[PDB]
Amino acid sequence: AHRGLITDRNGEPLAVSTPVTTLWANPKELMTAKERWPQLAAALGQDTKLFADRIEKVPGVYSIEEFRRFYPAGEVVAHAVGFTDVDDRGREGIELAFDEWLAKTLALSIDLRLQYLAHRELRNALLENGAKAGSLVIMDVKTGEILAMTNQPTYNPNNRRNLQPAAMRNRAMIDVFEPGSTVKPFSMSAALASGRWKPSDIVDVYPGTLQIGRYTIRDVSRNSRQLDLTGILIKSSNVGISKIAFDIGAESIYSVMQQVGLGQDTGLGFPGERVGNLPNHRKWPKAETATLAYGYGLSVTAIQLAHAYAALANDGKSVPLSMTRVDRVPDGVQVISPEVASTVQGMLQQVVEAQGGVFRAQVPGYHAAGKSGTARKNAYRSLFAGFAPATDPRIAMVVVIDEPSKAGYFGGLVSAPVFSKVMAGALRLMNVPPDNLP
Known part of the structure; x- marks a missing residue:
């Protein structure tokens, strides 16, 4: 059966079927032309005795057209596209995720x-x-x-030999890591939504360390005393965001991170895809409120992180993730109020500029x-x-x-x-x- 074409969003081929042949034979029609067996094996490239033992323009040798995949872009899209096995079945990536559909053209995003x-x-x-x-x-x-x-x-994917196990991992979707300072804009979204903080409010973060029991919260850059909220983001102040977190409570922060999809199911039916973890406590300890706020109290994938920033960029509205070309865009969910998202966008522009x-x-x-x-x-x-x-x-x-x-x-x-x-x-x-x- 001819497998459906996979293309990029513009029609560029990414996975194409090519015809192969299973040169089959019944162990009864071939047995009537034994004198032809060596000649077969010689053209086939097999050892006479090995072939003769295997059986025990040649009568009984017929062709059956089978199919196999090739990937025009090769290594460049290997993880997203994935591949099929010898029997042309989806074993990895899109090939596996859309196996039933493909075994009809599919345009990727x-x-x-x-x-x-x-x-x-x-x-x-x-x-x-x-x-x-x-x-x-x-x-x-x-x-x-x-x-x-x-x-x-x-x-x-066209040359699957001497492959290293490291090269096979779809890291963007499976590697879970602590996002660190990249989640501070979500902690800032909770602060702004709380009604207790404004971008111009000041936090005293000196000396760039903060002791919580036997644990010491430390900033990487420690040349600060008073920082406004934009300054906390520019300087990556773990101290500054922890103090804001103690004022607003971990629950407000956990809700924003949950709503933007951190440590949650992306909705993609992609094989292997990880979710990571967004912890939730009945009573949050002081050190966990702080580590959550500065990105060490949770674990996410690169896809969840891009998806969370996509919601922030789209005025707080989250549009569902898609690995296939989107013709009719779904409605989307307002996850952060648009006024807060707009203020956080302004601060993030200042982080860069x-x-x-x-x-x-x-x-x-x-x-x-x-x-x-x-x-x-x-x-x-x-x-x-x-x-x-x-x-x-x-x-x-x-x-x-x-x-x-x-x-x-x-x-x-x-x-x-x-x-x-x-x-x-x-x-x-x-x-x-x-x-x-x-």
Whole structure:
């Protein structure tokens, strides 16, 4: 049976059926032309005796047209597309998730142009920083479509030999990690929604440490005393966000993170896909309120993180995630009030653009918003999550760089230049008009 074509969103082929032949034979018609057996084996490329024992233009040898898959883009979309086995059955990715449907053309949400850009830049960043692995997710904030999803290391699905187990993992969907400072905008959304905090309110975070029993909350950058809420985000102050969290209570923060999908089911029927964990306590301990607020008290995937930022970018409205091309966009759910989402967007723009901010995440020609983070796995993950253009957001992106060995001090900000280059390239390919012109 001829398997359905898989294409990218523009009709580019990603998985195609090619005809193969099971040269079958009954052990009774062949047995009438034994003198022809050696000649068969010689053309077939098998040993005479092995073939003769196996049986025990040739009579009894007939063709049966069978099918097999090939992947025109190879390693570039290996994890999203996946592959079929010898018997042409979906064994990984979309091939497995849409197996019944395929065994009818299926258009993915992936834009192969953005996929080649993301793959290349993620690969270059891994080589420059001496990193072990990486992942990069690009989402259309208006449609919920996954426009690019790349993982490094990757494999060639057309050449499945000497494969390393590391290359097979769909990291963007299966690797669970603590998002760290990238979840502070959700902690800020709870603070703003509480009615107790405004962006201009000040928190005293000096000396960049805060003692809670035998536990010590520490900021990475410790040159601060009074910080407003934008400053807490710019400086990644774990101390500052913990004090806000003690004032608003962990329950308000847990609700926002739950609503944006952190540690929750994305709704995608993608095989292997992880959920991570968003803890919930009857009575929250002081240290867990703080660790939740600064991103160490939960575990998420890169897809959930991009999805959460896509909701923030889309004025607090969450559009369901999709791995297939979206023609009719679903209604979406208001997860953060639009006024709060709008204020948090403004602060995240300042994180990238303000003096002392993440300047390497700046996108030439556009206003961009985002937040960097480190995930302490010594070993760590460098993270960057953001969206652009900040005035009418179109794309949300998450960059994950695992164990950058060549990064010294400022190692945690290794993901920010990748976001800049991939965001600039994606917006230009998408013909997005610049919103930052002097």
